[PDB]
Amino acid sequence: GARNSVLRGKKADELERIRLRPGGKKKYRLKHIVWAANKLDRFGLAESLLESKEGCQKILTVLDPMVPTGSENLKSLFNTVCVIWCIHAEEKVKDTEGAKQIVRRHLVAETGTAEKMPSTSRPTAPSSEKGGNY
Numbered sequence: 001g002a003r004n005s006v007l008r009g010k011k012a013d014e015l016e017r018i019r020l021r022p023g024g025k026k027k028y029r030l031k032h033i034v035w036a037a038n039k040l041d042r043f044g045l046a047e048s049l050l051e052s053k054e055g056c057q058k059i060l061t062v063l064d065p066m067v068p069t070g071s072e073n074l075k076s077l078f079n080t081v082c083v084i085w086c087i088h089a090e091e092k093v094k095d096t097e098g099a100k101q102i103v104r105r106h107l108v109a110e111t112g113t114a115e116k117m118p119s120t121s122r123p124t125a126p127s128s129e130k131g132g133n134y
Contacts, residue, residue, distance in 0.1 A: 022095040055087035
């Protein structure tokens with residue numbers, strides 16, 4: 001909504017350094033961010049989440065299940081969001097592939113603590129239903 005450029009000086013040096021492929025010559029650019037942001041808008045998510053670790057994490061969780069229920073046009077985004085989050089979590093990568101791994105490992109670790117199911121999520125609110133319509 002404000003300013004013209006979002007990428008920083010040092011941060012950019014890392015993004016522009018990352019290559020779209022492991023052995024290719026193409027690197028990440030604003031072009032890829034746009035196509036990604038536009039998707040979040042139509043999909044139903046926010047765009048400001050692309051500039052926040054906590055935000056990008058909320059997006060990956062949505063595109064996660066979209067993999068087994070989407071096509072290349074979808075996988076591309078998922079592989080793009082995994083790169084943005086890293087930049088926010090202070091993770092140095094080399095190629096889209098390497099970045100995808102760093103993220104995956106971080107997810108499997110969080111989805112591997114269901115051997116107890118502790119009291120984390122608050123219970124249903126105390127709804128007192130008495131009577132009917134007026």
